[PDB]
Design a protein around this ligand. Structure first.
Ligand SMILES: CC(=O)N[C@H]1[C@@H](OP(=O)(O)OP(=O)(O)OC[C@H]2O[C@@H](n3ccc(=O)[nH]c3=O)[C@H](O)[C@@H]2O)O[C@H](CO)[C@H](O)[C@@H]1O
Ligand SMILES: [Mn+2]
Length: 478
């Protein structure tokens, strides 16, 4: 009638009643412990800073919202939970939120109108009372001893921003499934999140301790833990971002560049319900992405626009207060981030005309592992690099490592060969034509052509209508 109640006495049958398989689960339903064996018995500390848990939402399924909430209360030592702040971001039925205010520790905040996730998180952060923030989606389920490992890290160094491994809760059947602990957040020049294997070096490093924290260039997304002061000092979130994501890019760039670090803490596990086709699970409105790139990427932004020319036409708002933030924080340049934080991301030479994979539909130019005077071919694109990595240079050659596509015989039907690059060589000079849709051999009417793949390899051929002569570099600078 007016009282707060302990989570087990909450009337879930009532709340939920008033995909579907969500309402079938109990609010405190059991889930497999997906942790490494060594997390089992590590001894976590009593003397850790309590946290305010901000969960922001807009028309979340009640069964899932509730499940997140109890998940936190059930699996976190209660002395480390100061409060759980739910930010209702103008859900249509205010009751979805307000009803949960009845539970111990929960506090619910309402928005007049859709403010989006960024602004909602800032609201929750501001309302928080604890020294440390924990942000979670409205559809998560925390696993055993999920919280202590995160807090241990920020307690020790305020400038760490730490994420759990994010397990997967299936959107259809709600099976809780363990994710890998052997991956890092990354991206391609199109600023699309991808997962990376660890440094063959980094793997060795971890032999002595397989559950050690792991530095990550790019945050997996929204579940993370951060000192409240630090959060505010580094400028919170970009309040001008619209509700379509890519705040992950901006926060990752900002923390790293401005002196902080990002981490993934393998002993910390939180399930998440992934939407269909989300970039975490399946391998673009650019506003937010441009706001990141135009403030943080210095001149490398031009590789983003090389990958995504469409994006140069997307208006992105005023970024002045953000540029000023960067100045004040004396943040290091993007060049530094690439060299120190994400050296494995392949960066074109600043005088390369085009770079990346050279693809024809969904096939990619491939060396076939043919390291000297070899013929060349195609494989299905795999968006790793290696044998599928090429550049069009200032010198006008199509090169992979220090080998160059070479017209060895100008007769139509002649196979091209991969030879050592020489700037002398007229036989290794190529140019883009027809709006960067083909490769013509400079000084001829010969075009790179896959007609012959099944019969020897790629060939030079008289430039024509053939679609076996269509080739697009992933990045073009013209
Ligand atoms: C587990 C994880 O890493 N999740 C991230 C991922 O979430 P998801 O892609 O799973 O989406 P989400 O869970 O953040 O939100 C679900 C939908 O409701 C919207 N919504 C949600 C809350 C809110 O306060 N206001 C609002 O408008 C949101 O715009 C989205 O379309 O991608 C997001 C980019 O947008 C953020 O990086 C999330 O934190
Ligand atoms: Mn989500």
């Amino acid at each position: 009638a007016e009282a707060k109640v302990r989570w087990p006495d909450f009337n879930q049958e009532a709340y939920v009643g008033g995909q579907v398989e969500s309402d079938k689960l109990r609010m405190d339903r059991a889930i497999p412990d997906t942790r490494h064996d060594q997390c089992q018995r590590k001894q976590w500390r009593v003397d850790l800073p309590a946290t305010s848990v901000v969960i922001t939402f807009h028309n979340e399924a009640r069964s899932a919202l509730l499940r997140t909430v109890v998940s936190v209360l059930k699996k976190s030592p209660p002395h480390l939970i100061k409060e759980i702040i739910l930010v209702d971001d103008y859900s249509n039925d205010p009751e979805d939120g307000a009803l949960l205010g009845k539970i111990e520790k929960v506090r619910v905040l309402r928005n007049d109108r859709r403010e989006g996730l960024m602004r909602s998180r800032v609201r929750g952060a501001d309302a928080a009372q604890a020294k440390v923030l924990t942000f979670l989606d409205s559809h998560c389920e925390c696993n055993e001893h999920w919280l202590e490992p995160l807090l241990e890290r920020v307690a020790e160094d305020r400038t760490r921003v730490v994420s759990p491994i994010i397990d997967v809760i299936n959107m259809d059947n709600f099976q809780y499934v363990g994710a890998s602990a052997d991956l890092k957040g990354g991206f391609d020049w199109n600023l699309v999140f991808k997962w990376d294997y660890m440094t063959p070096e980094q793997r060795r490093s971890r032999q002595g301790n397989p559950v050690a924290p792991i530095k990550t260039p790019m945050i997996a997304g929204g579940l993370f833990v951060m000192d409240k002061f630090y959060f505010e000092e580094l400028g919170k979130y970009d309040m001008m971002m619209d509700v379509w994501g890519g705040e992950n890019l901006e926060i990752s760039f900002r923390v790293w560049q401005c002196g902080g670090s990002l981490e993934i803490i393998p002993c910390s596990r939180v399930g998440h319900v992934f939407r269909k086709q989300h970039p975490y699970t399946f391998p673009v409105f650019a506003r937010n992405t441009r706001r990141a790139a135009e403030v943080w990427m210095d001149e490398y932004k031009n590789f983003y626009y090389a990958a995504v020319p469409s994006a140069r036409n997307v208006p992105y708002g005023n970024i002045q207060s953000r540029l000023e933030l960067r100045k004040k924080l004396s943040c290091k340049p993007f060049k530094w981030y690439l060299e120190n934080v994400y050296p494995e991301l392949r960066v074109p030479d600043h005088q390369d005309i085009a770079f990346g994979a050279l693809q024809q539909g969904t096939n990619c130019l491939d060396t076939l592992g043919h390291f000297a005077d070899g013929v060349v071919g195609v494989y299905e694109c795999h968006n790793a690099g290696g044998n599928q990595e090429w550049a069009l240079t200032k010198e006008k050659s199509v090169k992979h490592m220090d080998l160059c596509l070479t017209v060895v015989d100008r007769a139509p039907g002649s196979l091209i060969k991969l030879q050592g690059c020489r700037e002398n060589d007229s036989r290794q000079k190529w140019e883009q034509i027809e709006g960067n849709s083909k490769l013509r051999h400079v000084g001829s009417n010969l075009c790179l052509d896959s007609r012959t793949a099944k019969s020897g390899g790629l060939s030079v051929e008289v430039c024509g209508p053939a679609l076996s002569q269509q080739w697009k570099f992933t990045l073009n600078l013209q």
